[PDB]
Amino acid sequence: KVWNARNDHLTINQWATRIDEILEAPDGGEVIYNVDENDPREYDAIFIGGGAAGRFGSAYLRAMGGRQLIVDRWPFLGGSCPHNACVPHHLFSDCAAELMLARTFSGQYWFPDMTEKVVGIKEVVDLFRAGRNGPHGIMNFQSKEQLNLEYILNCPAKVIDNHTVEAAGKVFKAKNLILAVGAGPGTLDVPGVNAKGVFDHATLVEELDYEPGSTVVVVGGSKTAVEYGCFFNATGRRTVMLVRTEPLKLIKDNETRAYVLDRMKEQGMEIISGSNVTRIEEDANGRVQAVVAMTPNGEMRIETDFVFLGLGEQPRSAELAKILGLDLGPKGEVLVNEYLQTSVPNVYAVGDLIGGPMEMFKARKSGCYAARNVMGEKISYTPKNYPDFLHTHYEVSFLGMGEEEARAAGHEIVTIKMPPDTENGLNVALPASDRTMLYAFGKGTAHMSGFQKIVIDAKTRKVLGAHHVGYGAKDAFQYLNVLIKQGLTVDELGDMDELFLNPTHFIQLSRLRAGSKNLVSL
Amino acid sequence: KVWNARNDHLTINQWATRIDEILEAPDGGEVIYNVDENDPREYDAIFIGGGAAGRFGSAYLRAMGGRQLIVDRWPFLGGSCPHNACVPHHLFSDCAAELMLARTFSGQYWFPDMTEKVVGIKEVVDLFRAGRNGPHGIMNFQSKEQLNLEYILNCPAKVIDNHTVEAAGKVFKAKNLILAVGAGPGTLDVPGVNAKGVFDHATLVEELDYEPGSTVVVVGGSKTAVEYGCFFNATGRRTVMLVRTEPLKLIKDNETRAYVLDRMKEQGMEIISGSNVTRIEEDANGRVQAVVAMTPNGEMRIETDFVFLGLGEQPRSAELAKILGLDLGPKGEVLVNEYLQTSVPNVYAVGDLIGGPMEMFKARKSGCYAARNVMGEKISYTPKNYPDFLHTHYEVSFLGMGEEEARAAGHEIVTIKMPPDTENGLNVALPASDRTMLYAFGKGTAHMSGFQKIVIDAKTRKVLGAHHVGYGAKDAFQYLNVLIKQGLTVDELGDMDELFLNPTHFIQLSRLRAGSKNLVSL
Ligand SMILES: Cc1cc2nc3c(=O)[nH]c(=O)nc-3n(C[C@H](O)[C@H](O)[C@H](O)COP(=O)(O)OP(=O)(O)OC[C@H]3O[C@@H](n4cnc5c(N)ncnc54)[C@H](O)[C@@H]3O)c2cc1C
Ligand SMILES: Cc1cc2nc3c(=O)[nH]c(=O)nc-3n(C[C@H](O)[C@H](O)[C@H](O)COP(=O)(O)OP(=O)(O)OC[C@H]3O[C@@H](n4cnc5c(N)ncnc54)[C@H](O)[C@@H]3O)c2cc1C
Ligand SMILES: O=S(=O)(O)CCS
Ligand SMILES: O=S(=O)(O)CCS
Ligand SMILES: O=S(=O)(O)CCS
Ligand SMILES: O=S(=O)(O)CCS
Q1: Are residues A324 and A416 in the same domain?
Q2: CATH number of the domain within which A434 lies
Q3: Signal peptide span per the entry (chains A, B)?
């Protein structure tokens, strides 16, 4: 039951295969024990959980010359991301974007006829399940062979006290504990929620044994709900989203949000805000048959055999809080100070366990900062002024302030956007670049070529916000945000070297206005 | 024959329509006269040509409060870019990328069967011709209504002397002249070069009245030759590229270049280096029937009815050099100093007219700098250390030094790349992100998921070069390059906020190594 893999050296593909076998193992599989029993040093920290936060924290701690140990109940490192979160989500979004293109130019050129064409959801999920072990293999390999990490996988950790942990039937002592067990799927307190056909991101890639009907009901207005919803709609199914409040409040710029929502509705998606599910109807077979919810316009009933819950995740703090006596927050999040320290001495908390923002950059960075503090390097971490994004059928990127938001805050501003405000509106061949060229040139599709805008302070000439809808700008926003935080002006932006045609046209458009001492919008 | 449009206000779509009509006008069309005859001020500069360089230079000069006049023989502003250069090229590249995806997953999921499927080239070119007026319309509109520019279109300029120009049958005086007539297609001195079926970027979108056969011969190893070549290959045609020297020398990093070339050959492209065309065979109908070229392995003959020339363009300096007495360079380029000034007083030269690099950022920026000098603001411009890119079936981005190049230069370096160097090689599920997820998860397609690398100086910890093959990183390279020129280290890169999954993984991968005082490659 315990496999000492320490002296074993599997390739990425061999790891992939071994992990799949352990995952399919009916008896549960063997414990993956990778500990250096010859090293006499004491553990500086034991990480409970080896996901994004735990794996990166360990990587950084080891890199600094300290000793660590990861314990994870899964037979692979990397956490939810490669198994049921970020990775599968991006596979689905890719399909959503490709399908919108195929449906828009159905029949034309090399595109097949999509009319009355329904794509198999289970087919795609099966594709994911069949290949998710690839990333898993790289993670175990990279972690062991390249990052020199010690770890025990496929084994739930038993925390004794703030310096003691049991794993693989053994007791380990450490100077510190770093809690990185993340968060779990949100629950919905309504009858029928356990009926067959009700899924969340986690169970979707584990229990989908049938192909969904023609209608899909998504509950939630989160990124996940929108991302998965656009994919389901792209497969050719009627998709209804039930949002408690208003959708995509995360997109502060009003025009940007309207463009995104307008394009979603144009694809046939139905978004009902101010709605609360009251009951999920089960048929005689214990299968979902319909959803009932209360809306501003009253109660409605939608027939469906497939329901996807996109609620927020909740920190896995219950057990740990009891064993260690940790102070918890309003939403079950473990409370920590600016150094990631919990209320218990020598115990840190990172990742989704400490709340939002629940993003990979937050998990990985908090993990590394906790490690640095553990190694004596006092450093604080408080995420703020970061870029963000989400997928619909398009890639949506945003940072800083929206146009209205900036004016309300007292900033005199001018904006540079595309397309321009004219009586032709969105119906013009711009913006345009990689992956939006067909839309830009197609008959009646120009309005689908995208939308983008930068918000500038008229007096300081500094960029206060950037927004983009299309493809190929997400990566750019990572670096653009750094420049903006350093104080980027329209003149400096205009003096850069653009790579035309560019997903973001901020550089050359800025150059067109930068010559005036008195800025004017474009 | 002369239409005074000054007081007319057409919409973007009305401009699009009017331009198309003038372009199709058998008699040649009317002159578009947009001059403010009430303005008593003298012209600070008259721009000969209203393309990228001329339009931007005018925009900036006007923005600074000076008076300008553009004269262009075409009925639209924007130059070659929207009519036969950058724009059509990106439309074709989009098709190339989409077709590779469709052929790789032929039949599977929603993808139709591509086996024995040939895409119509003329169909796509016709699509471009049908919609190119959209961008044209925005240019005339934006220029007139938003940038307040004065211009005379659909009228060749007659330069009298360094202060005098005739347009629309009238004489105009200016304090300066800014030459921005760009460059024209390179010529090939071999028999049969004028046979029907021989095209270059300019004639391809004007004279393609038939659908090409099963084989295509591309002459040149430039970006254009490679970009158009991958598109022709993607349509399902045997594509043979005849390169005089070696292909893609522009990609300095050896591993990056090899990955790009390997993927092209995998798609079925045949690249013959050290080859020189000796003759283009004409059939009894004056149509191309075959191409003969000398190669390192001897003379070869390729049957084909379609030949695309991707030679370098040549500056349109002949006439101007004679009229004004301009000193010219080895390749016909107009010589200028660091202020864009020619050998003739009060005469500047910009864009493709002054040589390489022949890119949009160079054209636009040189145009603006010439304008600033004309307005009394002495500023020098010398393009260097800029990012660059090109299309194959993938987007290829690069900046700075290649790995070998850096070591040769005396830099002690480490590299961070994906996928890693292991016995499984490229056959792993990384790198991966938007538009490469299917390749990453498909059976036998993992090696197609991409390639990327950053070159770092082991001692200074500074990034010396970045390279990427895939999709969605081009835009990022514009901003990343600015950070690198400001002195970016692996630690600073590692401290940024990534947006996972990201086209470039430089941020988190840097973070994985930044913890060590002694850097180690990944
Ligand atoms: C559907 C979905 C899509 C997302 N898309 C994105 C995206 O595009 N971009 C982005 O930046 N973020 C995205 N996120 C969020 C991101 O996945 C998380 O913020 C991040 O994975 C959290 O990392 P973590 O290390 O804190 O937790 P996790 O990665 O969730 O891992 C916690 C780890 O601890 C282990 N563990 C738990 N309990 C125990 C125990 N008792 N004993 C031992 N081990 C235990 C787990 O098995 C797991 O390996 C998405 C999330 C979801 C749900
Ligand atoms: C196939 C192809 C693809 C390309 N792809 C890219 C790319 O992806 N990215 C990039 O950055 N660059 C690209 N380039 C290069 C880029 O298009 C040029 O560098 C840029 O257009 C040059 O701008 P310009 O203003 O100097 O000339 P243009 O060549 O921009 O215009 C010159 C102008 O002068 C006018 N003119 C000429 N003679 C006269 C006359 N006698 N009287 C009046 N007007 C006259 C013309 O009609 C025209 O409007 C590409 C080029 C080609 C050929
Ligand atoms: O953040 S990790 O690299 O552990 C997993 C991403 S797939
Ligand atoms: O893209 S990354 O290499 O960071 C993670 C994949 S497991
Ligand atoms: O003239 S500009 O360079 O703005 C645009 C050509 S698409
Ligand atoms: O994208 S840009 O507006 O710079 C040029 C389109 S003509």
Answers
A1: no
A2: 3.30.390.30
A3: none
